[PDB]
């Protein structure tokens, strides 16, 4: 519209600019994450266009590190700055300290990047828009097993269970009546799987998800197509 | 070089010799060491010339921009402070000694002295240059308290005088200058005006 | 800070508006004239004032940029103002690398360079005026004519601000290539007086001659000889 | 219509609707109250949770070990804010070995917040803060808006339906001055559960509280570590 | 070199040499070392020749300017202040020592400008490495408000005392008179020591030279 | 001409165990032959678990110990925890070498508790170069102390001795005759001798009197 | 459409958005300020829009330098950002120039900081008019006003905000030139007390200060005792 | 200091002393010259320990994220190029460092010696440090490619052994490593004292 | 100041119960010719604070406008807070580590002596950054004349009287004439305590000059 700039509050303080990517994100693809002692599980549905495109360079699950890894849902290719930069914050934070960077402090450092969009002597080179991506960073720390969810507003929150994307209302909805705390990785990852084949428009099936899991002994693991055949059999 | 300034009732009298020398050879021998910052403030230049020129002409500058602001006539702390702050700051630069000398409603007559690195002091009598050497001890005699604007030419110009005869780097004619409320009277001494001490002889 | 984007920018039609916008401003300006001659050129136009109380002498219009170059102009002054101003630094760039005087076509080139950078630059309109400059270079004379847009012709004859059609009409009733410098300046009064709407005087109006000795403005009393005739 | 986009644009009123706009922000926010008595300051926070399943999104930060603060509106320039406070009060301690003053702190935070509502392109900080320190002349509270000015104040609450808050703290002011800590304390979880919908009520997970003293550092004690304060609280209808 | 420069009743007389030396060795009998500044004012140049030419030069580029903005002549002081101050800012490193004079609407003026940015006014100076031998003449034989003739006797004296008795300097004895009516530029106004007649020729016939190749590259003229 | 380092002198030690980590120092500062102070500990307290010894120039030791308090509240609002030894170390190595070509002329010593509940002794070089010892001395008389340590402690060169653990009271007792003997046979050292200890329950400081210059 | 920006005249050659910025000021509290014999006085009604803010919250009188005080009206963030401006031009002067800076040199460069900010788009005016008082034994008093607009004026008596007409005739008619800073202390109280509006502002906390030669060149703000006997008879003659 | 590395056919064999000085005092004899880079290579020290230390572990966060990128492990003549660029900049300012990057890729096993002056080279043998030259000796006279693994040790641990006795600079105790296809492996830490009751 | 022109000799600082007393001469030496002769090399910061500097003089001018501004905005802010001397002390550290760590270095070595919350303070600073606490201090050759002399007493004596310690001071001055070359009779003491600070004008050694008929 060219009206009002990117830094401006509605009457109400919302900050339309944010507002708008946040709901833009409902455009994204699903995603869950599920916290457990046993250890942490991220899915999401690979949302292939056709079936020329190959479904392995879809990459919406990353490493951070060993003991993080994320899922995202929205533009991607904000998604990958966003990591690019916990992945040197994480490196930079093993070179100067010997030891492994926390979740919280990770999106912390993360979401610093967001709400820092600026036209006006904002720097030589700037983003002029905020990043129009959720996060769902998981993984393993002194605490234990930890999610956090990083949206565009910056606000990163822990959370046991979540659901990003298009179907997060009722995916969330699902979470909340099935989980419980003392529940192990194996049932958590079948319920997650059980919800994005209930919200999923396509049939579930190895190809068109990605789904990895953190828990205290592995690193970040990515569930290969014979493991999520097995399951999806399973379940 | 040697330059001299001293404060009596109700104003200064500046002195300076006349003579810049390159190694031993005198470029100028009738050089006027005493610049005029501003109508009633002067300042006489030791050291490099060029330094000590070009400082003078940032300093009257600043403070004619600074008095024709503020409606007043300016302050001789003002005009040395200003001095100070630039030889402060590029003292490992230029090497130059001035004393400021003027005359303000507020406080009257005052002398300060910016020797080189850049310190600033007030002081009733004030010398400098490679001469000053060869005077201090008889500026500490004779100086009196309350001596007049006659009597403080005439201390001036036999300090400047023994100054030239013993010093090479200074010698020439004496310039000098008597500031005040009225205004400034400069005269030159020259020859026999020169005040003479008999050289001893066998 | 100031802005950083074009204030001029094509319009559907193709046409930049503000640059013609800025050519209606000059052609509102004063008549302004020139003619080239066989020994020399010749730069004329009117100076006149609201009232007597303007000092004539105080400033202007005709304004040398060297030795051997002067211009008129028709339009804003303060814009003919900096152009000189840039036009005589230009000259003296060009004076302290090649240690000759520069020539007329280059000074055009330049100057017409910085129209063109207040053209496309941001947060700047364009200059208003149209320039005439004039010069001696190589044993022939040269007159250029510099539009707001920074466009360069050449001209062996022309006119410039009010009545301009009807002043080159004029010129090219009259002009002729064998003239020489008096003659020039006989037509170049004419052409002024055609489009005056006054009583002419050595004061209204402000006339410069360019030769093989350089460029000078006529004082009040050789104009006013010339304006004898 | 026209006013309301720029920062840098006077209404014919003699309002700028921005600042106004970024202060409807945190009046939509976790509800805080700041309290303070001769010998200690708390900070009181409703902790407030996206879903069943989330956690309650801190409220309450260390800026110093005299000083802490509480925040309402948007987190990202929240935490920026204390980013600064924080390298104000380490290069305070660099320079001068001293703990900050929390007037010289909060003097600073309203020149840097003041910086962007006067000029093009910027946002007002649209954050307000509940500061809570202990210096030399003793216990303070501080109140912040994205407005720069900042108060001095002997309690405060600020977020969604703060004026319960308000009322029942300038009915009860007299007493806290003289109060020990934990019914200071349980005086401010009175005035929270006033802002809270009668419905609700407090319980461990969704409190936090934030206390400094003379000798005790300042100290967030979480929801496992509120229970001894609200322990004593009685009830309301 | 040898330089001077002296002021009269009217005007201003400046003098030099015309020897140019690179070490111990001649590279020009005849180097033209007074420079145009304005129509009033000329500067002579010792040191570094590059330094001095290329600081008139500039110097001169502002006067130009500044004096046909002003629509007035330059003032010597102008030319004086410009110099010092970008000299200094130089720190000495360029080293152009100057003598510049002019004739404006106050008068006739004298500057000696030294490579650190000192300065001194004066009605007589000299520069160069004949400077002390044409301040012997100067201070002998100097008088105030003398005529134009006898300004130019006493500097052809100056500069032939620095030439026959420094061997940089040379060849020659350049003259530039500036007076407030009239500027006269005597390039050679005297010679005081000329190449002796060659006794023998050497001239060489054609064909004394062998060439092993040859190439000849006719140009098209009109 | 102007040179920005000196010698002030200071000497410091560091001994670990199984449950603990001592750090002992003298207090003596001096430039040149002239002594400045008797009372200056050149042993700071970081943490809860933690201690630092500098030794050298005492305004890059000022420094250092500033710039490691700002760092260690850092990580600590950033990252929701204290720092420990190890990270404490490599942190210090990085600073040092920041300014590898105008250097801190400091020999610092690292000594605390780990997370395991070990003692630790980390020693830097003044470059930045940082290597994990059980014992190690630092300063003017290092040369003077390491050998007896290396005897005693780490029973070198020492035939059919029982290789014993070393015990708190042992540690004490050697580190004060160390010192001692230390203060006989050098100049820069000698004023006082503070032992601070860290231990599970916290930190303590002991004093005892050394031999005046 | 010519309101939007300070780079705008309106075809009547008005800049309106100073002139908003000055609707601003006059919807702020009245500051009143008087010049003397012996030195000035300032005096601000000083709104308690909450009885839990504490005594000496939002203060408007500032200390720009230790001879030079400020009353301020408006916007008190923009207000407390001038005083930093002058508190560092004060500090500027002093540090070149050797001496503390004549507050009509320093009017004048707060002024023109003041008249930058309208020239140009990218910034909005300030929203606070201001004065400024102090004491030299050579120079005296001074008391100088800046508008948003960026002209400053020396004044007998100022007075700014929403009363600044009634106030100016109470100022009128007090013969300030005579009296001393004791009395004058007196009569600005009554004159905040009457222009005081009990219906639209519910109460308000007097705030004072003064400088001159009882306090040898020094601004501070006003002992407590003297301050109640000002109040006290300020009611009285209120009635 | 001394240091060895050498190419055989069941992978690369990496030795260092133990011995760390400041001019003919020695500070330290436990020093890990060996650096483990990663599980997939390592590096060693000569010259400025904290140069070599520093660089190397700024090298293996360069390479963490080259493998976080690009989901392959990086190679050794792209690390080796990586250090020698990065050193290079600070050439002429003092640095003095040398080193020994070893590991595995699909080339094969992987050797690149990089040194401050800006050397970088490949090769089936390298010595670095005061004692190299004693160690060249002995490694080139007992080495061949068709070599067993137990023989790769032996003639590290003599040559390493040889070195410490003959350069004052080096001592200690040998920190003998072995790279393989899979991984680096901490084969021996034996001390050149136990090592002379052996050898004599 | 990469060379020094214009220094000032040792400055004398001791603590005794209730305040802290030092000690200067009023001296600015060029070169070994005693050119000026009446200048304080002592300041007055605060109320509970004064200051005592070597060497060149000018860095020291340089610190007094830079610290009086400091002061005089803590003064303005009228917050109830003011700057303590151990908290000066390690300003004016930071500030001579920095100018040295820029290689520009400021000559002189400040001595701080202060009386805030019922405690006596006295620190050194060097051109270097080096920093230190101690009841008593010199510079100068004063660290190898004077200090003996407090550190003597201090030791036998931990506590001292203002006349006490004025008295040793005194002592310490004279032995400074006596066999100091750059050191002037004339000399001010200041001294703070509760009241606050007090400088006292030109005083005399009074030398005895007895050992040389002998």
Known sequence: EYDRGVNTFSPEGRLFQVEYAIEAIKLGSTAIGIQTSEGVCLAVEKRITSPLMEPSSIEKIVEIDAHIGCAMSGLIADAKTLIDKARVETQNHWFTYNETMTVESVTQ?????????????????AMSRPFGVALLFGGVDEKGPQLFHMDPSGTFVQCDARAIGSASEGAQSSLQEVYHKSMTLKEAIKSSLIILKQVMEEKLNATNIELATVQPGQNFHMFTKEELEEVIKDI | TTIMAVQFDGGVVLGADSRTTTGSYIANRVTDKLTPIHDRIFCCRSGSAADTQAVADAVTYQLGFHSIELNEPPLVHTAASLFKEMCYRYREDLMAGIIIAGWDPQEGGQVYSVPMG????????????????????????????????????????????????????????????????????????????????????? | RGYSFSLTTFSPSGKLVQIEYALAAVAGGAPSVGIKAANGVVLATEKKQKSILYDERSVHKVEPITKHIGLVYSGMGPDYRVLVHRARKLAQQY???????????????????????????????????????????????????????????????????????????????????????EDAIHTAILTLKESFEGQMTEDNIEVGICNEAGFRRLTPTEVKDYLAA | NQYDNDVTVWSPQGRIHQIEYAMEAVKQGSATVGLKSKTHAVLVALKRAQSELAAHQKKILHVDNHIGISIAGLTADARLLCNFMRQECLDSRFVFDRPLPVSRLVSLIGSKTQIPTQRYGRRPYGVGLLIAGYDDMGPHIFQTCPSANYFDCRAMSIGARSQSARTYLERHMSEFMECNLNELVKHGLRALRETLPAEQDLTTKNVSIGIVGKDLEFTIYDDDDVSPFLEGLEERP | ????????????????????????????????????????????????????????????????????????????????????????????????????????????????????????????????????????????????????????????????????????????????????????????????????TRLGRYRCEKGTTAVLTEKITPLEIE | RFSPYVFNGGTILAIAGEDFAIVASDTRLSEGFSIHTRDSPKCYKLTDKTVIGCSGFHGDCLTLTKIIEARLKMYKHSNNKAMTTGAIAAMLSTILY????????????????????????????????????????????????????????????????????????????????????????????????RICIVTKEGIREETVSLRKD | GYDLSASTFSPDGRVFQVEYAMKAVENSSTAIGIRCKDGVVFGVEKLVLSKLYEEGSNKRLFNVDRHVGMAVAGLLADARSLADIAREEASNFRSNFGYNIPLKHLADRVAMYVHAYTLYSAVRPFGCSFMLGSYSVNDGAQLYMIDPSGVSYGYWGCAIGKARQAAKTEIEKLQMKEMTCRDIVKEVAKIIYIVHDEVKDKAFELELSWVGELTNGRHEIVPKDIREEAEKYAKESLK | ?????????????????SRATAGAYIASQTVKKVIEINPYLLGTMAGGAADCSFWERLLARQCRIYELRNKERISVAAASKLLANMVYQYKGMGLSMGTMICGWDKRGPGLYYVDSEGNRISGATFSVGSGSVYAYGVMDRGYSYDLEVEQAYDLARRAIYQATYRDAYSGGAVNLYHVREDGWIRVSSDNVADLHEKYS | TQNPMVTGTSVLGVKFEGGVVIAADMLGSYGSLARFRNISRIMRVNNSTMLGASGDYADFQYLKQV???????????????????????????????????????????????????????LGYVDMLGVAYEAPSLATGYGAYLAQPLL???????????????????????????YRDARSYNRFQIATVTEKGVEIEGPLSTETNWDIAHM
């Open chain 1, 109 to 125: 450092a993360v979401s610093n990047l967001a709400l820092q969009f600026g036209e006006e002597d904002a720097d030589p080179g």
């Open chain 3, 95 to 181: 004076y302290l690398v090649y240690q000759e005087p520069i020539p007329t076509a280059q000074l055009v080139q330049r100057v017409a360079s910085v129209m063109q950078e207040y053209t496309q630059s941001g947060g700047v309109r364009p200059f208003g005026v149209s320039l005439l400059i004039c010069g001696w270079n190589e044993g022939r004379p040269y007159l250029f004519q510099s539009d707001p847009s920074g466009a360069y012709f050449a001209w062996k004859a022309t006119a410039m601000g009010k009545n301009y059609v009807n002043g080159k009409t004029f010129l090219e009733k009259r002009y002729n290539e064998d003239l020489e410098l």
């Open chain 9, 67 to 121: 610290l009086g501004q400091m002061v005089i905005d803590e003064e303005l802010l009228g917050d109830g807070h003011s700057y303590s001397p151990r908290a000066i002390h390690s300003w004016l550290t930071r500030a001579m580590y920095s100018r040295r760590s820029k290689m520009n270095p400021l000559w002189n070595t400040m001595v701080i002596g202060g009386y805030a919350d019922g405690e006596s303070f």
């Open chain 8, 1 to 17: 200091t001394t240091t060895l590395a050498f190419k055989f056919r069941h992978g690369v064999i990496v030795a260092a002393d």
């Open chain 2, 118 to 202: 850049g310190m600033m002091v007030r002081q009733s009598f004030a010398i400098g240059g490679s001469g000053s050497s060869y005077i201090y001890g008889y500026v500490d005699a004779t100086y009196r308290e309350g001596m007049t604007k006659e009597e403080c030419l005439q201390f001036t110009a036999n300090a400047l005088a023994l100054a030239m005869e013993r010093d090479g780097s200074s010698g020439g004619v004496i310039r000098l200058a008597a500031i005040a409320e009225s205004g400034v009277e400069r005269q030159v001494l020259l020859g026999d005006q020169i005040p003479k001490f008999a050289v001893a002889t066998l």
């Open chain 6, 98 to 193: 920041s300014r590898r070509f105008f250097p801190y002329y400091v020999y610092n010593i690292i000594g605390g508790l780990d997370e395991e509940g070990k003692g630790a002794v980390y020693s830097f070089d003044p470059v930045g170069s940082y290597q994990r010892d059980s014992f190690k001395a630092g300063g003017s008389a290092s040369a003077m102390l390491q050998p007896l340590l290396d005897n005693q402690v780490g029973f070198k060169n020492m035939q059919n001795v029982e290789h014993v653990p070393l015990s708190l009271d042992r540690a004490m007792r050697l580190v004060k005759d160390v010192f001692i003997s230390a203060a006989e046979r050098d100049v820069y050292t000698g004023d006082a001798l």
């Open chain 5, 1 to 196: 070199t040898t330089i001077a420069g002296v002021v009269y009743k009217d005007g201003i007389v400046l003098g030099a040499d015309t020897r140019a030396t690179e070490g111990m060795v001649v590279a020009d009998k005849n180097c033209s070392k007074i420079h145009f500044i304005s129509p009033n004012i000329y500067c002579c140049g010792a040191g570094t020749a590059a330094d001095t030419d290329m600081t008139t030069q500039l110097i001169s580029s502002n006067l130009e300017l500044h004096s046909l903005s002003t629509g007035r002549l330059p003032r010597v002081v102008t030319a004086n202040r410009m110099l010092k101050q970008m000299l200094f800012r130089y720190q000495g490193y360029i080293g152009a020592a100057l003598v510049l004079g002019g004739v404006d609407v106050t008068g006739p003026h004298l500057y000696s400008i030294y490579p650190h940015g000192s300065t001194d006014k004066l009605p007589y100076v000299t520069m160069g490495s004949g400077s002390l031998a044409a301040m012997a003449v100067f201070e002998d034989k100097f008088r105030p408000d003398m005529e134009e003739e006898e300004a130019k006797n006493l500097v052809s004296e100056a500069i032939a005392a620095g030439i026959f008795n420094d061997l940089g300097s040379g060849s020659n004895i350049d003259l530039c008179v500036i007076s407030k009516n009239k500027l006269d530029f005597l390039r050679p106004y005297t010679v005081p020591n000329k190449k002796g």
């Open chain 9, 151 to 177: 550190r003597e007493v201090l030791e036998k004596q931990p506590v001292l009287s203002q006349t006490e310690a004025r008295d040793l001071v005194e002592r310490c001055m004279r032995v400074l004439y």
